[PDB]
Amino acid sequence: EVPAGLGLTAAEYAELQPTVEAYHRYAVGPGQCSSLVAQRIEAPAAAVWAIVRRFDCPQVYKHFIRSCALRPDPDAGDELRPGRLREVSVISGLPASTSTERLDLLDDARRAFGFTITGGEHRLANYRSVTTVSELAPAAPAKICTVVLESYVVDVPEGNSEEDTRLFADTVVRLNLQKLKSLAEANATSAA
Ligand SMILES: CC1=CC(=O)CC(C)(C)[C@@]1(O)/C=C/C(C)=C\C(=O)O
């Protein structure tokens, strides 16, 4: 029952399906499309999640982001609560110059993250994203495998097709996850 084109095996998806059925699901309207991307990372689940949970600094693992600035505190000092907004700057030439994104879900216990795009300069509208970090622990002593799942839903512009939009989003998402992998694996190598 593994969704087509995912990148995860049957044994792996069987464990992750509760996390898939809980955090990654969407109601897709005629002018919308959704997708789900998986990334395997060889690194502890805490290290990967520690990078992902930082809403203030997405430019660390996110490929096309030159700089980012977080909006000042509406009465929350030490912790980033859901409802916070950030303003993201993107490299030149891309469909988007800049984006304003809001924190939707941050759960440290269940290791789930999410955010929505409100406004800015870009073609993609109403982009909702959910990122979960999951640990697959072998009963016998094997290497560490952490699986990151990131799903989204987005509106398709009237001039753009569904593939062209989805291919673009999948591309950005995977470059983000490949960087997160590269980063967390280099950090997990030096520590022990
Ligand atoms: C790099 C870039 C180019 C655009 O045209 C749209 C937008 C500004 C939203 C974007 O930041 C896309 C970000 C995506 C798809 C996922 C994310 O970051 O989690």
Author numbering: 11 to 202
Q: How does the study describe this entry?
A:
However, owing to genetic redundancy of the ABA receptors, how the ABA signal is perceived and transduced has been debated for a long time until a breakthrough in 2009 when a novel family of proteins containing steroidogenic acute regulatory protein (StAR)-related lipid-transfer (START) domain was discovered as ABA receptors. ABA-induced interaction of PYLs with PP2Cs releases the inhibitory effect of PP2Cs on SnRK2 protein kinases, resulting in the activation of SnRK2s and phosphorylation of the downstream targets such as ABF transcription factors. In this study, we identified several candidate genes for ABA receptors in the turfgrass Festuca elata and Zoysia japonica, and then we confirmed that one of the candidate receptors, named FePYR1, functions as an ABA receptor through crystal structure and biochemical analyses. Furthermore, we found that expression of FePYR1 significantly enhances drought resistance in transgenic Arabidopsis.
We attempted to crystalize the three ABA receptor proteins, and found that only the FePYR1-ABA complex generated high-quality and diffractable crystals. The structure of FePYR1-ABA was solved by molecular replacement starting from a model of the Arabidopsis thaliana protein AtPYL2 with the statistics of the structure refinement shown in Table S1. The FePYR1-ABA complex crystal structure was determined at a resolution of 2.7 Å, and the overall structure revealed a receptor/ligand complex with 1:1 stoichiometry. The ABA-bound FePYR1 appeared as a trimeric form arranged about 120° from each other in an asymmetric unit of the P42212 space group. Although FePYR1 has the highest sequence identity with AtPYR1, FePYR1 displayed a monomeric form in solution which is different from the dimeric AtPYR1. The electron density map shows that ABA is tethered in the 428.0 Å3 of protein cavity with its hydrocarbon chain and cyclohexene ring fitting closely into the hydrophobic pocket of FePYR1. The terminal carboxylate of ABA is anchored in the bottom of the cavity of FePYR1 by an interaction between the positively charged inward-pointing K72 side chain with the negatively charged carboxyl group of ABA. Based on the structural statistics of FePYR1-ABA and published data, E160 and N186 are assumed to form water-mediated hydrogen bonds with the acid head group of ABA. Figure 3B shows that the mono-methyl group on the cyclohexene ring fits into a narrow hydrophobic pocket formed by residues F74, I75, V100, L104, F178, and V182, while the dimethyl group fits into a larger pocket formed by A106, S109, I127 and H132. At top orientation of the cavity, the carbonyl group on the cyclohexene ring of ABA points to the cavity entrance and is capped by the P105 in the loop (β3–β4) as a gate, and the R133 in the loop (β5–β6) points across the entry as a latch.
